[PDB]
Ligand binder design. Structure first.
Ligand code: FQ7
Ligand code: FQ7
Ligand code: NA
Ligand code: NA
Lengths: 115, 116, 116, 115
């Protein structure tokens, strides 16, 4: 996996399961081309989004459907979703873990980018 | 002031100063209409974006140009910007403070929402 | 005011009010000497803990009673408290704001340190 | 592993490697009995701290030596260390992941507690 997403729940202290994730690549359009999507697993992880071959350098957006997550739990959320937009390179490290820690009125997001 | 943005720098333990912020409102179509913009002051705060009258119910997006901020310090950060998207005033007028704490490869963001 | 504490609630998008805070200073031995205490106001802020004169160089510990806070809301949180331990004034007097954002199983904490 | 520690670096976007971690249990003394310790691995993880048998219910403290970490990197830090103090139970879920995301003037910490 050149790209994976991991989502944590700060209210329950658990992985955030069954969270919808959409990934997009910016076109020469400056519009957002759908690129990959999935639901987080029982461990709050989404793997298998793309391959090294297709994950070329460019700007990518990862959209995490946080509002549907909290609504399904019966908790009132603030944000429509959590978006992470970043340039994916070739020069440096190649595997990207985008992590998000979720609360109803806050979220933190980080990237772990390794060889 | 119904919409304020506060930005902190987690590397230096300081306000994040001169950070560009653009605000947008979603129309009955789904494109983002420009709504307000400004840049953070010496205290890392941006005020005076809007008024109670103008700040009606809707979906808003607050985009904070974190990349130019880090690049000005010589750092190539992970994110292009930090965007915060939320429904506002759907149960009546409220005051919203949108706060972001920034690191080169991470940021956290929280909202304080109060009823005046 | 050289030492202020600000506490936010990430579940409700609000200041964390009536949160107990105890501050301690480490002695030339390694036990923690009580230094100041208070509880956060309606805005989630606690001021007036100390003065420039009294707040000399040393290692300080700010302990925020997050567990009583959550328990008062019916929640059994993960942490017993959140403790923030830091050297202060080692290069001259500064003003320190210690901020904590709280969730039942998580918290973040940051310091804004300024030179008056 | 009933207990593990995972530490992330928010400045470099990597695991925090070679971070010293000390764990303590509160005695009837209200003093802090050393319980386990270790350095984080290349993946920012510390495993093998204890066993289900010895990890009985009680209050535990996890101390992460964040200042030594930043000093070794030549970056000025604010905190002496990051401490996490929590009660470890029997009633509910049994495996504890204590995660910390580190910046020089901030840190976030969460627990993922599962069966
Ligand atoms: O917990 C993990 O497994 C994890 C892995 C990669 C990045 C972050 C991770 N947790 C995490 C912990 C905090 Cl305190 C904040 C964020 Cl954003 C992620
Ligand atoms: O909100 C404030 O006024 C504030 C002031 C100083 C430091 C932090 C502050 N908020 C804050 C915002 C995030 Cl996203 C995380 C944390 Cl720990 C504090
Ligand atoms: Na975002
Ligand atoms: Na702590």
């Amino acid at each position: 996996c050149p790209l994976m997403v991991k989502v944590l729940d700060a209210v329950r202290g658990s992985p955030a399961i069954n969270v919808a994730v959409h990934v997009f690549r910016k076109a020469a359009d400056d519009t957002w081309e759908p690129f990959a999507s999935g639901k987080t697993s029982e461990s709050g992880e989404l793997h298998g989004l793309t391959t090294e071959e297709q994950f070329v350098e460019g700007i990518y957006k990862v959209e995490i459907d946080t509002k549907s997550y909290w609504k399904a739990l019966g908790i009132s959320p603030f944000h429509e979703h959590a978006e992470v937009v970043f340039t994916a390179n070739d020069s440096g490290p190649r595997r990207y873990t985008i992590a998000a820690l979720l609360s109803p009125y806050s979220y933190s997001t980080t990237a772990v980018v390794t060889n």
